[PDB]
Amino acid sequence: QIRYSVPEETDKGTVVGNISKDLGLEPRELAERGVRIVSRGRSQLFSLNPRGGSLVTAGRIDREELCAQSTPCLVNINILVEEKGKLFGVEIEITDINDNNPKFHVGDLEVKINEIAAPGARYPLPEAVDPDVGINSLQSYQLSPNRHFSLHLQTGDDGTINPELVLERTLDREEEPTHHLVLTASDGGEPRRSSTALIQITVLDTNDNAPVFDQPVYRVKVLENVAPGTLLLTVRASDPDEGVNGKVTYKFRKINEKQSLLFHLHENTGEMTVAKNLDYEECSLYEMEIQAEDVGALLGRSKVIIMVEDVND
Numbered sequence: 001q002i003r004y005s006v007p008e009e010t011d012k013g014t015v016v017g018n019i020s021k022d023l024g025l026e027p028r029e030l031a032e033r034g035v036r037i038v039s040r041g042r043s044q045l046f047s048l049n050p051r052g053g054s055l056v057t058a059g060r061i062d063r064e065e066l067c068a069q070s071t072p073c074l075v076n077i078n079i080l081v082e083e084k085g086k087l088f089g090v091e092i093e094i095t096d097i098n099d100n101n102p103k104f105h106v107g108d109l110e111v112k113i114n115e116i117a118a119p120g121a122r123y124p125l126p127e128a129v130d131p132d133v134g135i136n137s138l139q140s141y142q143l144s145p146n147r148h149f150s151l152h153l154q155t156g157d158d159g160t161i162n163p164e165l166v167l168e169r170t171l172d173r174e175e176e177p178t179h180h181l182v183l184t185a186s187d188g189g190e191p192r193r194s195s196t197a198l199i200q201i202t203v204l205d206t207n208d209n210a211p212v213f214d215q216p217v218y219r220v221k222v223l224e225n226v227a228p229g230t231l232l233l234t235v236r237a238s239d240p241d242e243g244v245n246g247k248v249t250y251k252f253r254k255i256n257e258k259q260s261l262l263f264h265l266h267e268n269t270g271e272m273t274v275a276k277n278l279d280y281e282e283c284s285l286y287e288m289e290i291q292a293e294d295v296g297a298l299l300g301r302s303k304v305i306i307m308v309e310d311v312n313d
């Protein structure tokens with residue numbers, strides 16, 4: 001019939017309730033009337049103090065290991081007055097305290113997101129478990145300020161929380177490849193508890209940058225009697241894409257139908273040099289079309305105007 005209560009994580013010899021008064025006895029008589037505890041299970045976590053006629057704690061008491069998720073933490077014990085032959089039921093409540101903040105299961109999480117991803121996409125975030133329940137349980141999720149994302153606290157009829165990261169501004173690894181965000185799980189206590197997990201956004205690459213030359217039109221003036229193999233020009237095209245998507249290949253547009261090449265444009269480094277003596281060819285003005293190509297078959301087109309200056313006259 002009796003109901004007591006006691007805070008958790010308390011010490012040994014801590015009062016639970018004035019049992020001598022509710023038992024119809026007197027303090028000194030507690031040892032005299034031969035009343036003891038019938039220790040069945042968790043009832044062993046308590047002991048009787050016959051000196052002051054009280055029920056006291058005799059071991060470590062923590063709701064997390066005893067009750068945890070259950071809203072009421074109750075321990076029902078049976079106390080027997082033998083001489084009177086009377087039995088009594090004692091229900092004991094346990095107060096939850098804040099000694100267990102919301103802790104994540106991972107200290108970090110990497111989210112691989114491609115640039116091509118349009119706003120509206122969503123990627124799951126870690127969750128922190130709260131051993132304590134109530135106000136001393138997980139209360140909020142805070143996300144460090146960014147420009148491309150937003151913390152969506154999803155909640156269904158299930159009851160629990162689902163923190164998902166929503167993209168609302170397109171990413172671009174050609175500008176910024178990685179991002180570092182902070183996921184703070186907070187708890188309402190005194191002071192407010194909290195833990196944090198790291199969120200690394202790894203922006204994967206897509207081939208969206210087409211090759212683009214340094215100049216629409218390349219211009220060079222060289223004497224006809226210049227030695228073959230002379231470095232006329234160093235052609236270059238830009239492609240900020242990652243690795244294979246950034247590999248640029250330079251070549252003449254009409255390279256396939258040509259017979260004897262007058263100039264050699266290197267496939268990789270794009271170095272344009274003299275192949276044959278320009279004097280014998282007797283050409284005074286060249287206007288050649290060149291192109292640059294990546295593995296995505298994206299083209300860049302440019303021109304090169306070679307003015308050949310005659311010597312002997």
Ligand SMILES: *[C@H]1O[C@H](CO)[C@@H](O)[C@H](O)[C@@H]1O
Nearest residue numbers: 184186191192193194195
């Ligand atoms: C998480 O947030 C709390 C405030 O809610 C801090 O007290 C704690 O140190 C951690 O930064």
Ligand SMILES: *[C@H]1O[C@H](CO)[C@@H](O)[C@H](O)[C@@H]1O
Nearest residue numbers: 107182183195196197198
């Ligand atoms: C949680 O987040 C904080 C940033 O507020 C980190 O400094 C900490 O190491 C933990 O990952």
Ligand SMILES: [Ca+2]
Nearest residue numbers: 008009062099
């Ligand atoms: Ca506790």
Ligand SMILES: [Ca+2]
Nearest residue numbers: 096097098132
């Ligand atoms: Ca607790």
Ligand SMILES: [Ca+2]
Nearest residue numbers: 100101136187
């Ligand atoms: Ca807590």
Ligand SMILES: [Ca+2]
Nearest residue numbers: 115172174208
């Ligand atoms: Ca891009």
Ligand SMILES: [Ca+2]
Nearest residue numbers: 205206208241
């Ligand atoms: Ca790219």
Ligand SMILES: [Ca+2]
Nearest residue numbers: 209241245294
């Ligand atoms: Ca490219």
Ligand SMILES: [Ca+2]
Nearest residue numbers: 279310311312
């Ligand atoms: Ca000549």
